[PDB]
Design a protein around this ligand. Structure first.
Ligand SMILES: *[C@@H]1O[C@H](CO)[C@@H](O[C@@H]2O[C@H](CO)[C@@H](O[C@@H]3O[C@H](CO[C@H]4O[C@H](CO)[C@@H](O)[C@H](O)[C@@H]4O)[C@@H](O)[C@H](O[C@H]4O[C@H](CO)[C@@H](O)[C@H](O)[C@@H]4O)[C@@H]3O)[C@H](O)[C@H]2NC(C)=O)[C@H](O)[C@H]1NC(C)=O
Ligand SMILES: *[C@@H]1O[C@H](CO)[C@@H](O[C@@H]2O[C@H](CO)[C@@H](O)[C@H](O)[C@H]2NC(C)=O)[C@H](O)[C@H]1NC(C)=O
Ligand SMILES: *[C@@H]1O[C@H](CO)[C@@H](O[C@@H]2O[C@H](CO)[C@@H](O)[C@H](O)[C@H]2NC(C)=O)[C@H](O)[C@H]1NC(C)=O
Ligand SMILES: *[C@@H]1O[C@H](CO)[C@@H](O[C@@H]2O[C@H](CO)[C@@H](O)[C@H](O)[C@H]2NC(C)=O)[C@H](O)[C@H]1NC(C)=O
Ligand SMILES: *[C@@H]1O[C@H](CO)[C@@H](O[C@@H]2O[C@H](CO)[C@@H](O)[C@H](O)[C@H]2NC(C)=O)[C@H](O)[C@H]1NC(C)=O
Ligand SMILES: *[C@@H]1O[C@H](CO)[C@@H](O)[C@H](O)[C@H]1NC(C)=O
Ligand SMILES: *[C@@H]1O[C@H](CO)[C@@H](O)[C@H](O)[C@H]1NC(C)=O
Ligand SMILES: *[C@@H]1O[C@H](CO)[C@@H](O)[C@H](O)[C@H]1NC(C)=O
Ligand SMILES: *[C@@H]1O[C@H](CO)[C@@H](O)[C@H](O)[C@H]1NC(C)=O
Ligand SMILES: *[C@@H]1O[C@H](CO)[C@@H](O)[C@H](O)[C@H]1NC(C)=O
Ligand SMILES: *[C@@H]1O[C@H](CO)[C@@H](O)[C@H](O)[C@H]1NC(C)=O
Ligand SMILES: *[C@@H]1O[C@H](CO)[C@@H](O)[C@H](O)[C@H]1NC(C)=O
Ligand SMILES: *[C@@H]1O[C@H](CO)[C@@H](O)[C@H](O)[C@H]1NC(C)=O
Ligand SMILES: *[C@@H]1O[C@H](CO)[C@@H](O)[C@H](O)[C@H]1NC(C)=O
Ligand SMILES: *[C@@H]1O[C@H](CO)[C@@H](O)[C@H](O)[C@H]1NC(C)=O
Ligand SMILES: *[C@@H]1O[C@H](CO)[C@@H](O)[C@H](O)[C@H]1NC(C)=O
Ligand SMILES: *[C@@H]1O[C@H](CO)[C@@H](O)[C@H](O)[C@H]1NC(C)=O
Ligand SMILES: *[C@@H]1O[C@H](CO)[C@@H](O)[C@H](O)[C@H]1NC(C)=O
Ligand SMILES: *[C@@H]1O[C@H](CO)[C@@H](O)[C@H](O)[C@H]1NC(C)=O
Ligand SMILES: *[C@@H]1O[C@H](CO)[C@@H](O)[C@H](O)[C@H]1NC(C)=O
Ligand SMILES: *[C@@H]1O[C@H](CO)[C@@H](O)[C@H](O)[C@H]1NC(C)=O
Ligand SMILES: *[C@@H]1O[C@H](CO)[C@@H](O)[C@H](O)[C@H]1NC(C)=O
Ligand SMILES: *[C@@H]1O[C@H](CO)[C@@H](O)[C@H](O)[C@H]1NC(C)=O
Ligand SMILES: *[C@@H]1O[C@H](CO)[C@@H](O)[C@H](O)[C@H]1NC(C)=O
Ligand SMILES: *[C@@H]1O[C@H](CO)[C@@H](O)[C@H](O)[C@H]1NC(C)=O
Lengths: 123, 432, 122, 124, 121
């Protein structure tokens, strides 16, 4: 499989196996239990894809944005984050700022998308 | 530095989760059609430089299996013959033919008036019953123990009670983590964790006091408890080597089919062929003594190098918890075990066993099941792979039992279910 | 750290010359690298830049259609394939480490290490 | 404003809350089936909308511009009235009869554009 | 032509009905839920696969993976003007997973390369 093989790797050693994890997301009571598990997996997948969509990251695994990084979220340089830290440690480190970052991403896409509409209205 | 938020999808990050697991497997109570085939080449990916905290006492996989096993049990019994018409006054006498003293008073010959194919005509039939299944009313008048608490369903004679390995497999978006840290004590950090598609096959072996046909410890005997200093908690002991136990029901039985009504029949125990002996189990004495010595040393590691450790038989209570209960060839044995826990630490052992046909499976009131007799002579050879002990200058340990969740904890202690959180963000120097 | 250039020599106008650079003392695959020219009597001129992985190459316009920059991370080497040489290409060609970045590490935009240089005469 | 808060606002006041409504489209055996039917229906409706955006060349966007000209036969109004006076409910009513016509044209223009793109990355 | 109407048409005679067929990918009653759930998962795997190849949102997607002559040594006219998609699917079935693997690797390199071109400044 290779699934989660990079879990113990550093952030810059990992994030090259993104398709490995991405492809692993996809008697009446037994049928119901199985359908609930399958429907839930589908709903979670679609919510994550919708979230990437509204940020302007649809169809990508590594998506660049226009949101500046705040030093209050993590006061670390790139060498520590990408060469020493793992993704599990990073997830713990910035858990409390996740929704703030997500909100900013949504707002920047809303401005960018509208700006494109105005640029395409010239001529 | 000028850093920007970069969004990643497919990040190898997970969080603790509780979900519904499915069942994989290779006419049977548990090998049901709902379960799907296993992967002929199971995958396991070792996670290097990963330490994950495990807690076998809060593992939702144990509760799910407990519920699923009970559900499969009831679904298996649902279509079988109901024996409500059997709850009639019995006229019982003792069986005195070729009876050894060990069996004197244990087996009764009961005659009764029961219905037949037609509702108007009745028939006079007889059946042999074990003392444990029949309660005296009002010398010769008896009733079944289930008459004042619940209707009883006869188990289907064609459906095996043999445990079949069941593998639990995660749905997509979730993962099962395996603790490969030898000598893991059931709680806390576990280095050397691997990700698997599913667990190994776990046989739903039902037993009390002694754990049969389970997994063995890789190097040392393991002593595990939620709180080792709390005498209200059970201690699970995992053996390094199995102790072989040879259990038998030596009497050669036959079976009489007595029709109750259209398409329905009750299976009565017929006359016994040959001599009547009791049931028993032979536990190798030298192996057992060595096994206890190992258990005592491991207990001393928690209770003190100079603490006296004594084994004693269980305290009183229901037969299902005071004896070693198990299903051997379709018969339910209730073995004394007192000969195994009778020593203080500082040829074979023969354990007498009783057979009961009316089984209240799972610690429930009602939903009784009647086990039909099995023809011939029953012999089982099993591996004892662990113990459930309770703690009473000197510490005393006694066989414990019940709950059933502990038997499944003894196998699922190394597995954890997590959910995958594929999204994450991190600073980079890349601007859109 | 060491960077040792090879190749070089005198090639007549219109010919082709291959330069190479052997690196040691650092992880080769972790740094972007470049080739820089120094005219025999003037200053330094940047010619080409290659990323750490080798997938991205950049050239100065004066050589954009004539030079190819290549990297082989299994041998710790750089190479430069120089076609259609003209009199204006006479120079010392230095192998240098630095110049670009890999996005997930601090930027450089400077040259950290230099070799001794190959002399190319047209 | 929250979910549908802009429903009574003008078309140009709305079309800035699209993520608010967009995020609300995804989120005893008889009760099991009833809940599953509700969840499966929500998923299928979402996917059909996304498939339409895909085949029109609008995947991943909430606002996308196209190459289909507006026909005066569908709505003979200028932008000042449509965007500053009208609401989206009134607009939906006004062009309901032409919805499938517009959809067909959008599909057709993407089919031409996609092929046109294929024939340009082929040069050289 | 409607759904599968172009099935017998040549590869270059089809490749114009892709939207028509794309539209058709989307108690006892549990059977219907199973049938509906399966369709959704199958649809999503294909969309996910297109996503990882960088082909999301498109019906025709050009890539940077060279065609290996060992997979099918034909002259393009043979493929697009004479052959149908069913015959083609049979001809290269053995190499489908190889092609898919290459496509995934190609996108990963391009995605990293794109990132490396978006912090130059
Ligand atoms: C721990 O694990 C061990 C295995 O390692 C278990 O031991 C086995 O236990 C079973 C049940 O007691 C033994 O019996 C076998 O039962 C099979 C099923 O019975 C069929 O046939 C009867 C006929 O009346 C039907 O009523 C029934 O519905 C089934 O159709 C039989 O098929 C087996 O027969 C095979 O083995 C015997 C060996 O004596 C041969 O003579 C036969 O020809 C045939 O090859 C068998 O009767 C089984 O034998 C035990 N295995 C071993 C190796 O001894 C333990 O029970 C388990 N412990 C616990 C607590 O579960
Ligand atoms: C089956 O039913 C018959 C009829 O009731 C029982 O026989 C009766 O037994 C009582 C005992 O006090 C006598 O007084 C009756 O005269 C008997 N009647 C007949 C017709 O025999 C018989 O005992 C029942 N059998 C069982 C096993 O319960
Ligand atoms: C069902 O009948 C059994 C058999 O009598 C009852 O068990 C007895 O309960 C009394 C009262 O607790 C005890 O003193 C006896 O020792 C029990 N055993 C016997 C053999 O009498 C049981 O309580 C009854 N249950 C119900 C719900 O009526
Ligand atoms: C357990 O061991 C006893 C012996 O202690 C076995 O009983 C013997 O069985 C043989 C059978 O051929 C007889 O000849 C002996 O006379 C028996 N001895 C005694 C003391 O009873 C018994 O069969 C064994 N049971 C199992 C299941 O292994
Ligand atoms: C069980 O009890 C019966 C009597 O109730 C014993 O006798 C047999 O009973 C059946 C009744 O169906 C008769 O058909 C047989 O003819 C009776 N036997 C004889 C010799 O007359 C029966 O033997 C007892 N069985 C055991 C194992 O104790
Ligand atoms: C674990 O750490 C060691 C430290 O020497 C390193 O060599 C190894 O590559 C690390 N494992 C992974 C998967 O990166
Ligand atoms: C970072 O967040 C704090 C609030 O926690 C805010 O005051 C500050 O201005 C932010 N800085 C940047 C650069 O976004
Ligand atoms: C998040 O906030 C809680 C307090 O509410 C704090 O205990 C925790 O450490 C914080 N986490 C981080 C990563 O700062
Ligand atoms: C069975 O035997 C016991 C003695 O063990 C005796 O007390 C009892 O009355 C007997 N019952 C019958 C029905 O003979
Ligand atoms: C298991 O071992 C850990 C040490 O790694 C200890 O903290 C914990 O209390 C132990 N638990 C039991 C039940 O012995
Ligand atoms: C174990 O039980 C004792 C009872 O006195 C209690 O003091 C102790 O805190 C318990 N430990 C745990 C880990 O629950
Ligand atoms: C169990 O029976 C086998 C024969 O099948 C015998 O070899 C073995 O020694 C017996 N074990 C015990 C503990 O009696
Ligand atoms: C059990 O083994 C110990 C030695 O570890 C020995 O002293 C003791 O007598 C043995 N007991 C029996 C019943 O063989
Ligand atoms: C108990 O004995 C072991 C040797 O088996 C020894 O290592 C340990 O230190 C002893 N502990 C005490 C408290 O004497
Ligand atoms: C435990 O053993 C003693 C001594 O033989 C006995 O009196 C007692 O009844 C036994 N307990 C049980 C529950 O069998
Ligand atoms: C087990 O055997 C002992 C032998 O002394 C006896 O006292 C005890 O009552 C027996 N227990 C059972 C449940 O038969
Ligand atoms: C326990 O050991 C003593 C030793 O004298 C013996 O008399 C007694 O019968 C034994 N009990 C059991 C149940 O083995
Ligand atoms: C039981 O007795 C019957 C008598 O016909 C015989 O055929 C059968 O083999 C016997 N079974 C055993 C296990 O002794
Ligand atoms: C008991 O364990 C041993 C371990 O080697 C195994 O070979 C044997 O088959 C097991 N016995 C049973 C009945 O499972
Ligand atoms: C409702 O209409 C008034 C003008 O009559 C306007 O000021 C107000 O913003 C409108 N409501 C919303 C939610 O836009
Ligand atoms: C507008 O629609 C009418 C049909 O109502 C049609 O005749 C006319 O050609 C269309 N014009 C354009 C530009 O699409
Ligand atoms: C749609 O057409 C019907 C006639 O079939 C007409 O009555 C209705 O008003 C039309 N709707 C619009 C919005 O023009
Ligand atoms: C079927 O084949 C004939 C030539 O044999 C061709 O003219 C016709 O167009 C084909 N059918 C379709 C739907 O293309
Ligand atoms: C083409 O495929 C063959 C067979 O797998 C392989 O040996 C060869 O290297 C491939 N060539 C290219 C350019 O992919
Ligand atoms: C695919 O492989 C099979 C052997 O498994 C072979 O018979 C068949 O010809 C192959 N097809 C192609 C197109 O290479």
């Amino acid at each position: 499989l290779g699934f989660l093989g990079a879990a113990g790797s550093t952030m810059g050693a990992a994030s090259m196996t993104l398709t490995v994890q991405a492809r692993n997301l996809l008697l009446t009571v037994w049928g119901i239990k199985q359908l609930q598990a399958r429907v839930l997996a589908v709903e979670r997948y679609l919510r994550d894809q919708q979230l990437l969509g509204i940020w302007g990251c649809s169809g990508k695994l590594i998506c660049c944005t226009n949101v500046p990084w705040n030093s209050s979220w993590s006061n670390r340089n790139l060498s520590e984050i990408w060469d020493n830290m793992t993704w599990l440690q990073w997830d713990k480190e910035i858990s409390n700022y996740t929704q703030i970052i997500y909100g900013l991403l949504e707002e920047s896409q809303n401005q960018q998308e509208k700006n494109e509409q105005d640029l395409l209205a010239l001529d | 530095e000028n850093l920007w938020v970069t969004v990643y999808y497919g990040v190898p990050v997970w969080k603790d989760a509780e979900t519904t697991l499915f069942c994989a497997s290779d006419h049977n109570v548990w090998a049901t059609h709902a379960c799907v085939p296993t992967d002929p080449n199971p995958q396991e990916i070792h996670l290097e430089n990963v330490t994950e905290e495990f807690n076998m006492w809060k593992n939702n996989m144990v509760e799910q299996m407990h519920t699923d096993i009970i559900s499969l049990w009831d679904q298996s019994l649902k279509p079988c013959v109901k024996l409500t018409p059997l709850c009639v006054t019995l006229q019982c006498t003792n069986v005195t033919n070729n009876i050894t003293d060990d069996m004197r008073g244990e087996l009764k010959n009961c005659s009764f008036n029961m219905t037949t194919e037609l509702r108007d005509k009745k028939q006079k039939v007889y059946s042999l019953f074990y003392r444990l299944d029949v309660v005296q009313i009002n010398n010769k008048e008896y009733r079944l123990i289930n008459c004042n608490t619940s209707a009883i369903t006869q188990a289907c004679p064609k459906v095996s009670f043999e445990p079949i390995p069941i593998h639990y497999c995660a749905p997509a978006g979730f993962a099962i983590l395996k603790c490969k840290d030898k000598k893991f004590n059931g709680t806390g950090p576990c280095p050397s964790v691997s990700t698997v598609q599913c667990t190994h096959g776990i046989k739903p072996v039902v037993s009390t006091q002694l754990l049969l046909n389970g997994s063995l410890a890789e190097e040392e005997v393991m002593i595990r408890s939620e709180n080792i200093t709390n005498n209200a908690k059970n201690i699970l002991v995992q053996f390094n080597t199995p102790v072989q136990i040879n259990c038998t029901r030596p009497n050669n039985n036959t079976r009489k089919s007595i029709r109750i009504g259209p398409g329905q029949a009750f299976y009565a125990t017929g006359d016994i062929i040959g001599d009547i002996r009791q049931a028993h189990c032979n536990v190798s004495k030298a192996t057992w003594n060595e096994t206890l010595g190992k258990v005592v040393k491991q207990l001393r590691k928690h209770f003190g190098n100079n603490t006296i450790i004594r084994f004693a038989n269980s305290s009183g209570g229901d037969l299902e918890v005071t004896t070693h209960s198990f299903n051997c060839g379709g018969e339910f044995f209730y073995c004394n075990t007192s000969g195994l826990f009778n020593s203080t630490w500082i040829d074979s052992i023969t354990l007498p066993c009783r057979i009961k046909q009316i089984i209240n499976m799972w610690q429930r009131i009602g939903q009784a099941m009647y086990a039909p007799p099995i023809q011939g002579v029953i012999r089982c050879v099993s591996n004892i792979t662990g113990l459930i002990l309770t703690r009473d200058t000197t510490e005393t340990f006694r066989p414990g039992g019940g709950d059933m969740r502990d038997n499944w904890r003894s196998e699922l202690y190394k597995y954890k279910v997590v959910k995958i959180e594929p999204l994450g963000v991190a600073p980079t120097r890349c601007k859109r | 750290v060491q960077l040792v250039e090879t190749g070089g020599g005198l090639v007549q106008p219109g010919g082709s010359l291959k330069l190479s650079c052997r690196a040691s003392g650092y992880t080769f695959s972790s740094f972007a690298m470049s080739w820089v020219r120094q005219a025999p009597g003037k200053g330094l001129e940047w010619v080409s830049l290659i990323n750490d992985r080798g997938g991205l190459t950049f050239y100065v316009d004066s050589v954009k259609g004539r030079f190819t920059i290549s990297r082989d991370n299994s041998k710790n080497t750089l190479s430069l394939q120089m076609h259609s040489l003209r009199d204006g290409d006479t120079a010392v060609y230095y192998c240098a480490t630095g110049g670009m970045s890999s996005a997930l590490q601090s930027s450089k935009y400077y040259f950290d290490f230099w070799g001794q240089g190959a002399l190319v005469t047209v």
